[PDB]
């Protein structure tokens, strides 16, 4: 049987932050990954 090899998912993680002087809330952006692998 013939198998495809697809590399496991990966990508950079960037943090969205308003300036700390305003607040400490943070939202995280996972680059180029479907919202299932998370």
């Amino acid at each position: 049987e013939i198998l495809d090899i697809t590399p496991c998912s990966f990508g950079g993680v960037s943090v969205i932050t308003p300036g700390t002087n305003t607040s400490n809330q943070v939202a995280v952006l996972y680059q180029d990954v479907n919202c299932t692998e998370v």
């Binding site: 590399p7 990966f10 990508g11 950079g12 680059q31 180029d32």
Partner: peptide, 22 residues
């Protein structure tokens, strides 16, 4: 007319072609 997995990530542009058209 105008026409891999090694850590090479292609970031998307901020203005999609749609807003550029506007």
């Amino acid at each position: 007319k105008v026409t891999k997995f090694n850590g090479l990530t292609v970031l998307p542009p901020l203005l999609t072609d749609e807003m550029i058209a506007q």
